[PDB]
Amino acid sequence: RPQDSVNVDAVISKIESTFARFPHERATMDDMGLVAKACGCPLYWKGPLFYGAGGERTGSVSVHKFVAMWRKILQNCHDDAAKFVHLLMSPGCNYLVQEDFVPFLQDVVNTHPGLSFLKEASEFHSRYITTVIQRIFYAVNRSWSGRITCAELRRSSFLQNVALLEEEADINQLTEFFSYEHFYVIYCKFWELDTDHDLLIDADDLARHNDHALSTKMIDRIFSGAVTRGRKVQKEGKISYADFVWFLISEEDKKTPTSIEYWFRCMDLDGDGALSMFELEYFYEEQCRRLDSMAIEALPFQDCLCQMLDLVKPRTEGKITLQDLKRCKLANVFFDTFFNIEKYLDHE
Ligand SMILES: [Ca+2]
Ligand SMILES: [Ca+2]
């Protein structure tokens, strides 16, 4: 059998032929896989399609409601990225926020063969879901706006991964977003720190994570609001599991575009988009003191600065920009120099 036509009338006709198979021409969630195929969508769009047509409100979706919606989508959305954003977005918002992904991911948990074991343990559903969503925004939401647009989604590999869910029974093969194994490792590291089990960790806890390799001034910036995704205004002195995920991923690889932005935001004390000499010295100050505790005589700030200027080659004298750090391709060295002491554990 040859491929289906792509045009509007043909697609609508195919949808109608599919709904004609349903009692009362209303689709339940169990029918939505067939509906996804009629739409030329990957299987795991079934949840988004159902919720998109308000299925959660009445328990089913009539052909008339679904067709009217899909007509609109085909009029407004030329590609998969546009269609996906349209399905998940809140009315009034031309973008996706973290919470928009929850029903989709819950359906993935409820139905994907690779998560069957997890499905019967709803205790950890939300934490798995939270983890996947963090990894999605970490990779996709390059503007740090908290709002994923069609353009951002289009530039990512996210939808490719969604399409692959139906092809891979072992979800752990899909390492970028959905991997349960990646979630497990991340969660267990959080668990080690959260010793009183209140699902929050403080600065003392966070310092333990890599054996006090990060300076206390940098640890304090993690708690400042500079990188929090939770939009909280007050300095609460504790961070959530969700924010820990962002820290862990950033700390383990300081070379990725998102991670460079993460550490840049922390160093950018006044949040003006440039690292001033005051800001660099503020951090390097503590590095020297820590190095002293290890019988290492640190370079004076101006000597260290010579080497960093040569490493980074910033465009404008007197400041280091995010663009400078990305272009030098050695931002991890820059960051480590200013706030990371790998073998600080061995200090005497
Ligand atoms: Ca705790
Ligand atoms: Ca600044």
Numbering used by the authors: 134 to 481
Paper text:
As an alternative approach, we identified a chymotrypsin resistant core of the PR70 subunit (residues 130–483) using limited proteolysis together with mass spectrometry. The structure of the PR70 core fragment (residues 130–483) was solved by selenomethionine single anomalous dispersion (SAD) phasing and refined at 2 Å resolution yielding a final Rfree of 19.3% (Rwork = 16.2%). However, we find that the structure can be more accurately described as a tandem of two calcineurin B-like domains, which we have named CBLD1 and CBLD2, connected by a 12-residue linker (residues 301–312). Calcineurin B-like domains contain four EF-hands, which are arranged into two so called EF-lobes, i.e. pairs of tightly interacting EF-hands. In agreement with previous observations, only two of the EF hands of PR70 are loaded with calcium. These EF hands correspond to EF5 and EF7 in the present structure, but have in the previous literature been referred to as EF1 and EF2 respectively. On the other hand, EF5 is distinctly non-canonical: it lacks the two conserved glycine residues, and position twelve is occupied by an aspartate. However, in EF5, the aspartate does not interact directly with the Ca2+ ion, but forms a single indirect interaction mediated by a water molecule instead. As a result of this unusual arrangement, the chelated Ca2+ ion is coordinated by only six atoms in an octahedral pattern, with two of them being water molecules. The structure of PR70 in the heterotrimer shows small but significant structural differences as compared with free PR70, supporting a degree of induced fit upon binding.
